[PDB]
Every structure is written in C-alpha cells, then in structure tokens.
C-alpha cells in the first residue's frame, strides 16, 4: 500500500513532465528509430519507465528518483550534439526540473515526508 514516499513522487514526477512540453523525454527513444542509441548508452531512461518503477513502488528515496532523472538528462546529452534540438531540451529540463527536484528535497527536510507529500 502507499507510502507518503510515492504520494510525493507522483507530484514530483508530474511536475517534471510539466517541463517537457514537446514530450521529448515522455517515452522510450526508439532503437528502431536510432539503432545504434544503446551502442553509446547503457542505461536509457525516460519519464514513462520511471512512472513504471514509481508505482511498483521501486524508489527506496528521493534520491534513487533523482538519479534516474539524472539518467534521462545525462544520456540526451552524452548522444546528441551540442548544436541539437534535443541537446537543447536536456539543457533546459535539466535546469528547469532540477528547480523542482530541489524543492521538493528542501520541502522534506524543512516539514518531513508525510507534511511534504501533503
Ligand atoms: C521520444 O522519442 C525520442 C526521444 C529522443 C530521441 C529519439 C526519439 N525517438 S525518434 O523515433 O528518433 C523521434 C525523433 C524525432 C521526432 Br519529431 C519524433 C520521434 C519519435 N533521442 C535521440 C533523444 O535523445 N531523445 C530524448
Ligand atoms: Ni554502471
């Protein structure tokens, strides 16, 4: 059943995908689309996978859920060109959702878990 962990994350989670309005991070890339992507990244992430692993409940903290942000941001911008528009996308989530990430670790540690799930 439901930790205020997840209750959290759902928000959080939510609040990142607020970010992505072309919907450039919402899915798996396509390696039928780009076959050689999994030559270079050994880790793919993307919002869709980590709303999977959140409610099967696989996060143990907010800091497991951060890294797996961090996979999405950090594999677009080890694939991509600078001069790219997805480059350009991971540069602008990465700092734009990390405004969100911050917040919510900020919102725990000032009023606690279950307060800041709320
Ligand atoms: C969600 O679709 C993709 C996302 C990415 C991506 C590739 C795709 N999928 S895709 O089939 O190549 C595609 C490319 C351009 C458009 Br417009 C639409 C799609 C689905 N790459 C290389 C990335 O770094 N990202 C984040
Ligand atoms: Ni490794």
Redesign the pocket.
Known sequence: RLTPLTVLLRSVLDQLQDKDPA????????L???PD?LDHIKHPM?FATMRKRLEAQGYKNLHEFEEDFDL?ID??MK??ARDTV?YR??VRLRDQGGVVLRQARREVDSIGLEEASG
Do not use: G, H, L
Not at 23 to 30: C, E
């Open positions: 919907r450039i991070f919402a899915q798996p890339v396509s039928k689309e780009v992507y993307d999405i594999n677009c694939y991509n997805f996308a991971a």
